[PDB]
């Protein structure tokens, strides 16, 4: 339909989905040793966001959703993004407590 990555402005709250950015282009169609097993993998270009849901299985793959797609993401390729919320307190003022 219409829903997907973006479009439906945020109205209510939802489950926490770890955001992971792609470090390099991933092609499970050519990279993967087999296409059949490649289906389980989730392709993504560098700089692409992947709504990761949960942790990674033994293999070490993060199951996330990107571009209205679902599959496995190689924790090796992608990476964790920095926190958006207020950052830690650095150089705490000299003021006395």
Swiss-Prot record:
Could you tell me which residues carry Phosphothreonine?
8
Q: Where is the SH3 domain?
A: 15-83
Q: Where in the cell is it found?
A: Cell membrane; Synapse
Q: How does it assemble?
A: Interacts with RIMS1, RIMS2, CACNA1D and CACNA1B, and potentially with other Ca(2+) channel alpha-1 isoforms.
Q: What is known of its domains?
A: The SH3 domains mediate binding to a proline-rich motif in RIMS1, RIMS2, CACNA1D and CACNA1B.
The text of the family note is:
Belongs to the RIMBP family.
Q: What is the protein's known function?
A: Plays a role in the synaptic transmission as bifunctional linker that interacts simultaneously with RIMS1, RIMS2, CACNA1D and CACNA1B.
Q: What is this protein called?
A: RIMS-binding protein 2
State the organism of origin: Homo sapiens
Source taxonomy: Eukaryota, Metazoa, Chordata, Craniata, Vertebrata
Report where the shown chain sits in the full-length sequence: first residue, last residue, total length: 841 to 924 of 1052
